[PDB]
Amino acid sequence: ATALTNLVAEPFAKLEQDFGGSIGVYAMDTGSGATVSYRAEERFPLCSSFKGFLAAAVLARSQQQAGLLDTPIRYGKNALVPWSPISEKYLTTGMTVAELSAAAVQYSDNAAANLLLKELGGPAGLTAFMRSIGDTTFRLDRWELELNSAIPGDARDTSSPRAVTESLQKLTLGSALAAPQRQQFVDWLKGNTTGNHRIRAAVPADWAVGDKTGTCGVYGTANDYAVVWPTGRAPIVLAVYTRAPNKDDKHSEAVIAAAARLALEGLG
Numbered sequence: 001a002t003a004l005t006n007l008v009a010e011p012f013a014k015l016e017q018d019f020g021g022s023i024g025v026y027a028m029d030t031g032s033g034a035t036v037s038y039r040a041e042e043r044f045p046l047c048s049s050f051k052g053f054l055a056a057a058v059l060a061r062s063q064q065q066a067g068l069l070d071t072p073i074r075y076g077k078n079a080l081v082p083w084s085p086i087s088e089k090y091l092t093t094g095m096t097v098a099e100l101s102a103a104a105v106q107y108s109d110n111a112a113a114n115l116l117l118k119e120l121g122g123p124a125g126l127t128a129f130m131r132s133i134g135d136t137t138f139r140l141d142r143w144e145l146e147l148n149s150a151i152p153g154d155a156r157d158t159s160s161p162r163a164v165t166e167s168l169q170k171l172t173l174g175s176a177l178a179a180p181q182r183q184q185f186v187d188w189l190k191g192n193t194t195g196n197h198r199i200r201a202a203v204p205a206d207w208a209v210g211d212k213t214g215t216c217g218v219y220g221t222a223n224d225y226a227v228v229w230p231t232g233r234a235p236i237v238l239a240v241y242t243r244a245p246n247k248d249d250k251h252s253e254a255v256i257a258a259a260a261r262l263a264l265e266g267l268g
């Protein structure tokens, strides 16, 4: 007999009632292969969460371009956009590709993400990297900040929780990348600073977590994805995405953390 997915689903539905929108969740236990899935194939806006996959695409590029990571990108004023706290600090000097990548992942630095997008040939460059690892769902169309609009019905700049999770698993645990680059991706995720009230809030403090958040700032639209390493057990890969129908519906970190908990607890 298979899982009773109605029973697995029930507490997510309840959560989304008080939230006033939609929650998408996919979790995969890499030990057992068990999964939790709720609206896991619906599209949700990526917001800043594309920046993790961006860093991975940069790492993929570096495999073929020795020293790309230690190459400084020296930029002007036009690179800068709000929510770019690290790239703003280094305007007068520049930042290496590695530094920009760390800033994109760990501070969700907007300007740094746009600078790296330019290196890959724009949003379409990153989408093409995702297609190269078999993600047919992911689509990044625009740049920071336009990609944050999160307008109801817009398929631009979205993916599914499931596709996010499968791609995250390929890049962090599978061999999609070479082992040094894979470790570098994990290290960047592990050092994220913006995720303490989301998936990390659901995980025992002594378990290692790498994550990337997104917060569009409208339409209740926010997210997190992560790899979790329970001590002495196979890692878990999961993604939690939200949206809501009104522009002024608040997003909620508590809801994200609650959905992560339900997902993690439901794996077996």
Ligand SMILES: *C(=O)N1C[C@H](NOS(=O)(=O)O)CC[C@H]1C#N
Pocket: 047, 048, 049, 082, 083, 107, 108, 109, 110, 145, 148, 194, 213, 214, 215, 216, 217
């Ligand atoms: C991305 O979604 N961002 C970047 C920035 N940081 O928030 S995040 O949730 O940590 O990713 C502010 C909100 C939004 C923008 N712009």
Ligand SMILES: [Cl-]
Pocket: 075, 076, 077, 078, 079
């Ligand atoms: Cl400029």
